[PDB]
Design a protein around this nucleic acid. Structure first.
Ligand code: MG
Ligand code: MG
Ligand code: MG
Ligand code: MG
Ligand code: MG
Ligand code: MG
Ligand code: MG
Ligand code: MG
Ligand code: MG
Ligand code: MG
Ligand code: MG
Ligand code: MG
Ligand code: MG
Ligand code: MG
Ligand code: MG
Ligand code: MG
Ligand code: MG
Ligand code: MG
Ligand code: MG
Ligand code: MG
Ligand code: MG
Ligand code: MG
Ligand code: MG
Ligand code: MG
Ligand code: MG
Ligand code: MG
Ligand code: MG
Ligand code: MG
Ligand code: MG
Ligand code: MG
Ligand code: MG
Ligand code: MG
Ligand code: MG
Ligand code: MG
Ligand code: MG
Ligand code: MG
Ligand code: MG
Ligand code: MG
Ligand code: MG
Ligand code: MG
Ligand code: MG
Ligand code: MG
Ligand code: MG
Ligand code: MG
Ligand code: MG
Ligand code: MG
Ligand code: MG
Ligand code: MG
Ligand code: MG
Ligand code: MG
Ligand code: MG
Ligand code: MG
Ligand code: MG
Lengths: 104, 55, 72, 134
RNA sequence: GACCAUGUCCUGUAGAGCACUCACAAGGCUAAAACCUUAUGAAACUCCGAAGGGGCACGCGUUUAGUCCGGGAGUGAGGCUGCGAGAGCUAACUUCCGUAGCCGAGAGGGAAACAACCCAGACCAUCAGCUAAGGUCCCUAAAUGAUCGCUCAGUGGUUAAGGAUGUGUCGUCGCAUAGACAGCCAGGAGGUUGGCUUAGAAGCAGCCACCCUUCAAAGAGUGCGUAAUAGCUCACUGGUCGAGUGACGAUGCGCCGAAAAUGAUCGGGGCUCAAGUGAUCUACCGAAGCUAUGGAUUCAACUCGGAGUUGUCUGGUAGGGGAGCGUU
RNA sequence: UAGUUUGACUGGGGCGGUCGCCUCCCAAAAUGUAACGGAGGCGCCCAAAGGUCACCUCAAGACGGUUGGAAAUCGUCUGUAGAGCGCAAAGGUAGAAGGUGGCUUGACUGCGAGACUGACACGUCGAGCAGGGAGGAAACUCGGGCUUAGUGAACCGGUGGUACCGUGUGGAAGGGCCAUCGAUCAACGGAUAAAAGUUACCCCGGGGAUAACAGGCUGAUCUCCCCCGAGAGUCCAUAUCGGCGG
RNA sequence: CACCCCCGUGCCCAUAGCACUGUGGAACCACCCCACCCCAUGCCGAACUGGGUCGUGAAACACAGCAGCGCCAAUGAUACUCGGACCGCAGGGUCCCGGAAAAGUCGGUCAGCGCGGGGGUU
């Protein structure tokens, strides 16, 4: 089964560290990748791909990361924890991290 | 509440002995008035078999 | 027979409603009979000691789901 | 009555019965009045005598069973070393716990069957007929 | 500090349950493991799970202890009882732990007597008073007390399995002024000297099975009988008979069961014409406990330059401390 | 010839057994708690069974299947676990501690706030700081192993560093310190470096703290009685005898 | 929190889960789609994974009905027990006061609260 995600999301015990976590959903390339402060039941920085276009999924993903980096920097955030989903750090998601911390 | 010792403390388990002592009757035939406060009302229920509760 | 082994005075060393210094030991256990909540960190033999000074509180739905947090 | 394999030894105590206060299976039955151990052999004698009264019968459940070993110390020995090895098995029998339960035999026949089956027993007992049963 | 109350947390015992492990009770199902209905035990089994118990905090309440630091010790053989376990034989004035209390270190009243049990912790003095346990017939202090019973056994004043038309209190089942239980006369039947048996077994050794006729009236039918039938009785029938009976049951008090060694006994006398008993209620006796008057110490406050007042305290072994008396 | 050694517990001594550490029950729902009480393990292992990063999910059953068939192996369905965890068990564990690879050694040096535990002495856990490493993209995790056994103070010495003492001064001999090695000293807090019997020729000092006798308490065993009643007694349980049980 | 609905991520922590089942469709999600290479399978693009439309709501998933199952679960009555006070030689047991389960019945539920976004009534 997909015991990848409960495992990786129990390994964010370091939400006790105070950093926010950055969920990603390499599914339909919907890769919405929310930023969450877990303590409240609250999310703070959405970046859904509704009509961003940008072409092939591996590069639209980096576009989603570079746009969300601004979308969260507006509110005043910089500590980061990359709560990957079940997905590997394989590239199409790795571009999201590269472009996200390229412009925190 | 009126209280009077009419039982010896001898030979009775030591919680009852420190209970009568803090009640402040050190000898049988002692009496005293007492507050209605639940703390002391339970202090007297604990050793009611030693005392004559009057009120 | 006639053999036996030393006591290991294990337990809930600090009960909920007890202020604790950092590094106080609060539960002793063979394993994770307690699973350590926020502020607490669990050692090698799975004793869990508070990291932060404050009150001790028990999260406890039970059945292996009992956790010890500390509130400042 | 003997238990085919176990762990070796036990202990003892008593308080009133919580398993088998009501009869099933049979027509009539018999109940303890006194707490006690009962040996395998006391059972087997009740079986022998109630099978004497029940020729070609087959209505003899034995709703009790020697579970507990009890181990006397050997010949003449001063104390020291274990409980020897088990000398006989016994069944705890607290009051109100049924022992016996017949069917298919008329009231006075079961009544005599229970007379003899109790007289070999080390306890008071009583015959009962079933009706206040859920 | 200590007890007690509130708040909170932690626990896996009693109990209780089979959901796992071992065990185990009657069946159905089936190449029997498995499975289902039903049924159970478990120190090393737990789906559960109190009472209590421990830590914290408060004191929202009565009390007086505690903590550390320095001098001196002794003790490191425990004993019983009750509760909870182990070991034992559910033995022991047994042995080993937990726990409470007494004894050790404890006087006084009770238990005839008696470290441990029940009452009650002795500062001193009194020819003063109330009580505790326990008592009130004489010994022997104090009701031959009162009221409803219970037991006629000296039970009381030594056990049990088991028996008993012993006796009260309720209580369940039948058949009766269309007249029953014992109780007297009257009948005892039919194939049938019934199948199944050993050598004969024929109400009436005994394994297997009980229907059918003639009847106001009787079961191929009870215990006896010689080895078999008769034989006197019985279960239904009847003139009489004239009113209750018989059954298992719960129980209260008793009987038997119930033999040991120098001489008997409840402590003794004696007790039912209660001095036994269960239920109630008083009235008094009854301690070195409590109260009264007097008296002195330990401590502490309170006053004057140990004294005195008020409170309080004063059983005591090893021991620690303190004030003093006697001899050279 | 001589001076000595020759262990303790022990329902009396001897014999047998035991002596240290771990697990469970006893242990009476805190911690603790005895027994020659009931059960069983340890005197090690692992260059990866570590650190880290990443990835898989186990028994067992049924239907189906090649030489195998109750159980090799593959295939489907059910499958909070009925498996596994190096050895014993309890706890624990399914988001892993179980299984499988890549990298490397934190199986580091210097420290230790705070506590748990113990009469001590030992023992346990431990956040975070330095120097510097290792894995990861990072958060982060590493100063051994899921945990609890795998162990012995102190003395006297071996080996490598270091440059403190080193006797008049300079050196060296020797010593100190840091590291490490030598222990069934297992009677496992460990009397010496170095040790067995025997006494009925016995002697002393003690003990009813403790056996042989006798009394006592108990009454398993012993002696006796009673209940039942199977059968024996042709017949008929009880004239006698009375199984198995109480 | 205008009304629904979807993707995700929390709190909760079986009264939320199972099964039977019906709705769902290019809006969302999901399989199918191809593989020399990023990247990978101790064999397989099944899994990760990279390049995408059709197709299809089949399967999975979401959401409703659903009391066969599970899950919860009284009251009442006990068991037991703190203190008090008793009987039995003994195993054992009783009484007064107060605390009081477990099992079972009665009955309850196929949940309940957020946060961000996506597309709807245009
Ligand atoms: Mg018990
Ligand atoms: Mg039951
Ligand atoms: Mg043994
Ligand atoms: Mg206080
Ligand atoms: Mg039990
Ligand atoms: Mg306790
Ligand atoms: Mg305060
Ligand atoms: Mg001192
Ligand atoms: Mg001693
Ligand atoms: Mg003792
Ligand atoms: Mg025994
Ligand atoms: Mg003794
Ligand atoms: Mg002794
Ligand atoms: Mg003494
Ligand atoms: Mg004393
Ligand atoms: Mg006395
Ligand atoms: Mg006496
Ligand atoms: Mg006298
Ligand atoms: Mg004496
Ligand atoms: Mg004396
Ligand atoms: Mg005595
Ligand atoms: Mg008394
Ligand atoms: Mg008087
Ligand atoms: Mg009186
Ligand atoms: Mg007189
Ligand atoms: Mg009797
Ligand atoms: Mg009179
Ligand atoms: Mg009077
Ligand atoms: Mg007097
Ligand atoms: Mg006096
Ligand atoms: Mg005076
Ligand atoms: Mg004194
Ligand atoms: Mg005094
Ligand atoms: Mg004195
Ligand atoms: Mg010796
Ligand atoms: Mg304990
Ligand atoms: Mg002791
Ligand atoms: Mg791991
Ligand atoms: Mg650290
Ligand atoms: Mg570092
Ligand atoms: Mg790196
Ligand atoms: Mg050297
Ligand atoms: Mg030596
Ligand atoms: Mg030693
Ligand atoms: Mg000589
Ligand atoms: Mg002497
Ligand atoms: Mg002696
Ligand atoms: Mg002797
Ligand atoms: Mg002899
Ligand atoms: Mg109730
Ligand atoms: Mg009470
Ligand atoms: Mg009690
Ligand atoms: Mg009650």
């Amino acid at each position: 089964r997909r015991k990848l995600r409960t495992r990786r999301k129990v390994r964010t015990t370091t939400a006790a560290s105070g950093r926010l976590r950055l969920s990603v959903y390499r599914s339909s390339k919907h890769i919405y990748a929310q930023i969450i402060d877990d303590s409240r039941g609250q999310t703070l920085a959405a970046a859904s791909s509704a009509a961003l276009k940008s072409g092939n999924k591996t590069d639209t993903a980096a576009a989603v990361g570079k746009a969300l980096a601004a979308a969260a920097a507006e509110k005043g955030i910089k500590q980061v924890v990359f709560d990957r989903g079940s997905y590997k750090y394989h590239g199409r998601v790795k571009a999201l991290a590269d472009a996200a911390r390229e412009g925190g | 509440m009126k209280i009077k010792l009419v039982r010896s403390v001898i030979g009775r388990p030591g919680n009852q002995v420190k209970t009568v002592q803090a009640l402040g009757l050190r000898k049988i035939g002692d009496s005293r008035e007492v507050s209605d406060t639940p703390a002391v009302r339970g202090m007297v229920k604990t050793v009611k078999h030693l005392l004559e509760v009057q009120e | 027979n006639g053999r036996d082994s030393n006591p290991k005075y294990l337990g809930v060393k600090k009960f909920g409603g007890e202020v604790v210094k950092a590094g106080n030991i609060l539960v002793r256990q063979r394993g994770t009979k307690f699973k350590a909540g926020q502020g607490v960190g669990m050692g090698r033999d799975h004793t869990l000691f508070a990291l932060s000074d404050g009150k001790v509180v028990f999260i406890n739905k039970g059945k292996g789901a009992r956790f010890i947090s500390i509130e400042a | 009555k003997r238990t085919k394999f176990r762990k070796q030894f036990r202990g003892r105590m008593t308080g009133d019965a919580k398993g088998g206060d009501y009869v099933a299976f049979g027509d009539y039955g018999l109940i303890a009045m006194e707490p006690a151990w009962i040996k395998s052999n006391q059972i087997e004698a009740c079986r022998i005598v109630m099978s004497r009264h029940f020729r070609r019968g087959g209505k003899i459940y034995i709703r009790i069973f020697p579970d507990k070993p009890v181990t006397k110390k050997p010949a003449e020995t001063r104390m020291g070393k274990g409980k020897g090895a088990v000398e006989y098995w016994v069944s705890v029998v607290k009051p109100g716990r049924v022992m016996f339960e017949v069917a298919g035999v008329t009231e006075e026949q079961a009544k005599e069957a229970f007379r003899l089956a109790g007289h070999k027993l080390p306890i008071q007992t009583k015959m009962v007929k079933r009706e206040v049963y859920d």
